[PDB]
Each structure stands twice: as C-alpha cells, then as structure tokens.
C-alpha cells in the first residue's frame, strides 16, 4: 500500500508546501561585471547546490519514496533542469524583465553568453505568463511535483495514480478560489500547457550545457556532469 | 553515481 | 469565428479539416531517411493547408501563422504518426505501405531511442483509448500552444475553446466530473513528452543536415527555424 | 522570404 493516495487535497498541499526547498544565495559580488565564464561559473555553483536540495525535496514528494531507487534516479535525471527552471520562473514572477537566480543575483535580458538570450526570453515569457495568470504558491508546488513524476514516466500505474491525485488537488484549489467549473478546466489546461514549454526550455538549456561542457569553458561539478550525461 | 548515493542516504 | 462555434461545431470542423494519410514511395540508413524525408515533405504541404482550416488560425497575422507552424511542425507530424500507429502495437505506421519496427530504427544512429518514445506514446494512447475527436483537439492545441510564448489573448481564447471542447467530449462519453479533469490532465501531460520527442528528433535531423540524404527546401526552412 | 509564406497564402 501507499500513503500518497490516502492524503486529502489539503494534506497534499501542506506536504508539498512543507517540502519546499530554500532559496539559495549566489557568490555574486557586484564588483566586476560578468564575463561568459564568470556568470556561468556562478550559475553552475548555484545550480549544483540547488540540486542537493532538490534530491532531498523529491524524497519529500508523496509517492516518490514508494518508487524504486532506479526509477527515482531516472525521474530526477530527466526533470532536474525543468524543476530548476520552474523554480527560477516562480522566483522571478514579481520581477518583470528580470530573472531572480538568487536574491542577490538579478539578471537582465542584456546580461548573458552566445545562445543565452534565447533561453532567457523564454524564461522571461514564462514568468510573465505566471504573472498574468496570478499563479498561486499552492498551484506552483503541484506543478513542480507533476514535472518530477511526469517528465520521465514514458521513458507507472502508481505514478499515474499520484498524478491523478495532484490533478484532483489542483481542481480542489481552484474550486476553493471561487472559479466556476469551466474556469477550473481552462486554468487547469493553461497550467499544464506551460509545462510543455518548460520542457522545451529544458531541452534547449540542456543542449547549451552540453555545448559548454565539450568546449571546456567553466568546469561543471561532478553531479552536474552526471545529470547532463544522462541526456546524452 | 552521485545521484544514487544522495538519494539512498540515510 | 472560432469562439462562436459550439463544441460540436468545433469537433466537426477539425474532423473535416483532417489531412489525408499519404503513402510512402513504393532498409539502410540512407534509404530509410530518404523515404521519410520524402514522406514528411509531402505531409507538411497538407499540414499547412490543414492549419489554415483550423478555427482561429486564419485570424492570426501571416508572421504569427508562420511562427506557430515552424515551432510545432515536427510535433504535429509525430502526434499524427503516433495516432496512426495506435492499432499497430510495436509498430510505427509512417505510411500504410511503410510499417517500421523498433529493430528497424537501429540502422540509424540515435533513432532507436526516438522510436521507443514514439512507440510508448502510441501505447499510452491505446491504453487511454484515445478517440479521434480527442486527437484532433490535441493536435490543434499543439499548433496554437507550442509557439505562443515565443512571441496572444486570442490564441489563449481559442485554446480555452478547445479545452471546453475536450471536456464536452468526455462529458458526452459518460465520464464523471473528476474523471474529466483527470483524463484532460493525462492528455495534456502527453503533449509535454511530444515536445521532448520533437526536440530530440529535431536535433537528429540537424545531424542529417550536417552530413549531407538531401533534405527538401521546405524541410530545410522548417529546420533552420530552430537555430 | 520563406517558402512557408507562399503555401500559407495559396
Ligand atoms: O535555478 C537555476 C540555476 C541555474 C540555471 C542555469 C544553469 C547554469 C549552469 C548550470 O551548470 C546549470 C544550470 C541555466 C539557466 C537556464 C537554462 C540553462 C542554464 C544556463 C542559462 C540560464 C538555471 C536555473
Ligand atoms: O510522419 C512523419 C514522417 C517523418 C518523420 C520524421 C522525419 C524524417 C525525415 C525528415 O526529413 C523529416 C522528418 C522522423 C521521425 C520522427 C523523428 C525524426 C525523424 C527521424 C525518425 C522518425 C516523422 C513523422
């Protein structure tokens, strides 16, 4: 048996909210500006530290513990950049035109690397989309968990069971928010369509990292090399 | 695998 | 005009705009990619005309129509392929006279991985018992959504209409309210995987260009749109 | 200009 299927929507939200990783700080000092190496150096250091919290966060996600060690590795290997991005997009939600990689690291469209502006714009666009939708924290934590369980599910009936539970959780929140039945379906559809774009940004971002790796620009951490190799 | 270790502990 | 149509009139319009199932030219690496390039190139011409028959797509500017097609053309081909291969488990029905196996994807480097993802998506549709009415809605969603954030209110309004249409079909199928929410979510989550396959396939086609079978002029343009 | 332009117009 499992415990994720048993939890109600309110207890589902609570568990996810309680599981939320902290917002890590960067090593950024506003002294020297950013070269293509220094900026990516900061981001690599930041992302590598974020991963450690994500892995332990994933173990707090209802149902993820019930999975095998092999399956847990696969799901994290597939969705780690997606989860980083949606977290990034969420942090930058109330900072129009900016990306909040860290509270002390606020990057503009001008800042940032050959091929970074394309990814930045898509990230900014996603952030602008969350802002117009007035995304709630309760919806965000649900979406982030959906990405973890979904992004590597076709590469299972229990995973789809938890996924269905998160769907119910989302609808329950919208019903509470006073939305009509058709407004719930529309917003539910709107939220999940964004995940397709987050997937797109991840694939684009992943290819940029592999480009940075082979070019031997700034050295990637040992964990980031492993997560990147899993995408080949 | 680092991801394998960080997952299994403790 | 798209917003005016009811759910029934939305389905009927999409069902009527459906592109035909084309045939392949009547394998190694070169011969297979030659047949697929020829096939995909002829499908694109029908897709473009199909897109123009999609409610709300005509109302967009010429530039926006171009951008959307450039973004999702491989996604649209794939979901079509996946749908055609639904009642052929383990097989990919690229064309009625071109049935490809998982072992046939091995003689092209980095294609057997894309085959399995496609086969898995087809298996997922088969398990969900995906309906043709549902399929035409999903394909239209891919067309309007995949390139909407790389730019809007009208596109999001048509997307909401197709959502209303999707729910309508399930509500007419006899599904309960929570069953409608869950099935809708399940369908839309698959689109995230279709995007993934597309980006993988796109990178595979780029390797093909950086090796000189000759891609068609149209395909080269659709490909170049992904930098 | 792109070929896609013509096919969308014709
Ligand atoms: O929270 C985040 C932290 C960092 C990032 C970083 C990143 C940088 C270096 C890495 O080695 C790994 C990731 C990504 C951002 C978005 C996609 C790729 C990259 C590079 C550009 C910005 C994205 C989100
Ligand atoms: O119906 C379809 C027809 C072809 C395809 C395309 C394709 C092939 C050659 C091209 O020049 C362009 C695309 C392929 C399939 C999907 C991924 C890319 C490629 C390679 C293997 C399968 C996908 C669906």
Peptide bond into B10 cis (omega under 30): yes
Instruction: At A22, list the tokens.
Output: 């902290």
DSSP-derived pairing of the beta strands C91-95 and A99-102: unpaired
Instruction: At C86, list the tokens.
Output: 């639904």
Q: What domain count does chain C have? A: 1
Query: How far are the Cα atoms of B6, C61, C94, C190 from residue C124, in angstroms, in the given order?
Result: 32, 36, 18, 9
Q: Could you give the CA distance from residue C107 to residue C29 in angstroms, rounded to a whole number?
A: 6
Name the residue range of residue C91's domain.
1-227
Q: Could you give the CA distance from residue A171 to residue A177 in angstroms, rounded to a whole number?
A: 10
Chain breaks in chain D (C to N over 2.5 A) after: none
What's phi and psi for C2, nearest 5 deg?
A: -65, -40
Ligand 1, residues A47, A85, A127: which to mutate, most atoms within 8 A of Cβ? A47
Distance from the first to the final alpha carbon of chain D:
15
Residue in the block written with tokens 């926006």: C64
What's phi and psi for C94, nearest 5 deg?
A: -65, -40
Q: Could you give the CA distance from residue C162 to residue C141 in angstroms, rounded to a whole number?
A: 7
User: Which residues are bridge partners to A102 per DSSP?
Assistant: A105
Distance from the first to the final alpha carbon of chain C:
34
Radius of gyration over alpha carbons of chain B, in Å? 5
Least Cα distance to A143 among C209, C188, C77 occurs for C188
Resolution value, angstrom units:
2.4
User: Which residues are bridge partners to A107 per DSSP?
Assistant: A99
Q: Could you give the CA distance from residue A201 to residue A221 in angstroms, rounded to a whole number?
A: 21
Residues whose CB falls within 8 Å of the CB of residue C94, separated by 6 or more in sequence, listed in order: C24, C35, C36, C39, C81, C84, C100
Q: Could you give the CA distance from residue C22 to residue C93 in angstroms, rounded to a whole number?
A: 11
Sequential DSSP letters for A183-227: HHHHHHHHHHHHHHHHHHHHHHHHHHHHHHHHTT-SPPPHHHHHH
- C185 and C7 Cβ atoms separated by less than 8 Å: no
A179 touching chain C per CB within 8 A: no
Query: DSSP label at C210?
Result: T
Instruction: At C210, list the tokens.
Output: 């950086």
Burial, C176: exposed, middle or buried (Cβ in 10 Å; 0-12, 13-18, 19+)?
Answer: exposed
Instruction: At A227, list the tokens.
Output: 């997560």
Sequential DSSP letters for C61-117: -HHHHHHHHHHHHHHHHHHHHHHHTTTSTTEEEEETTEEEETGGGTTSTTTHHHHHH
Chain D residues with CB under 8 Å of a chain C CB are: 2-5, 7-9
Instruction: At A166, list the tokens.
Output: 């998160």
- C145 and C194 Cβ atoms separated by less than 8 Å: no
- A93 and A135 Cβ atoms separated by less than 8 Å: yes
3-state class (DSSP) for residue C134:
helix
* CATH number of the domain enclosing C38: 1.10.565.10
Residues 204-223 of chain C with CB under 8 A from chain D are 217-218, 221-222
Lining ligand 2 with CB less than 6 A are C 33, 36-37, 39-40, 43, 77-78, 80-81, 94, 111, 114, 201, 204-205, 215, 219
Q: Could you give the CA distance from residue C153 to residue C161 in angstroms, rounded to a whole number?
A: 12
Q: Could you give the CA distance from residue A49 to residue A43 in angstroms, rounded to a whole number?
A: 10
Query: How far are the Cα atoms of A98, A165, A214 from residue A57, in angstroms, in the given order?
Result: 26, 19, 30
Which sign, positive or negative, has the C-alpha torsion A176, A178, A182, A185? negative
Instruction: At C148, list the tokens.
Output: 């909407």
- A189 and C163 Cβ atoms separated by less than 8 Å: yes
């Amino acid at each position: 048996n499992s415990l994720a299927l048993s939890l109600t929507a309110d207890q589902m939200v609570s568990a996810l909210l309680d599981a939320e990783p902290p917002i890590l700080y960067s090593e950024y000092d506003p002294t020297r500006p950013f070269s293509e190496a220094s900026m990516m150096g900061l981001l690599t250091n930041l992302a590598d530290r974020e991963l450690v919290h994500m892995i332990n966060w994933a173990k707090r996600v209802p149902g993820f513990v019930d999975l095998t060690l092999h399956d847990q590795v696969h799901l994290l290997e597939c969705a780690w950049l997606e989860i980083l991005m949606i977290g990034l997009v969420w942090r930058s939600m109330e900072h129009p035109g900016k990306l909040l990689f860290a509270p002390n690291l606020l990057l503009d469209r001008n800042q940032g690397v050959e091929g970074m502006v394309e990814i930045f714009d898509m990230l900014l666009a996603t952030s602008s989309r969350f802002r117009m939708m007035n995304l709630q924290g309760e919806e965000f934590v649900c979406l982030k968990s959906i990405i973890l369980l979904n992004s590597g599910v076709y590469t299972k009936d229990h995973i789809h069971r938890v996924l269905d539970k998160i769907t119910d959780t989302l609808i329950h929140l919208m019903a509470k928010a006073g939305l009509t039945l058709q407004q719930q379906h529309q917003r539910l559809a709107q939220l999940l369509l964004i995940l397709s774009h987050i997937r797109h940004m991840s694939n684009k971002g992943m290819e940029h990292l592999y480009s940075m790796k082979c070019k031997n620009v700034v050295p990637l951490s040992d964990l980031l090399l492993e997560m990147l190799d899993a995408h080949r | 695998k680092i991801l394998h270790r960080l997952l299994q502990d403790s």
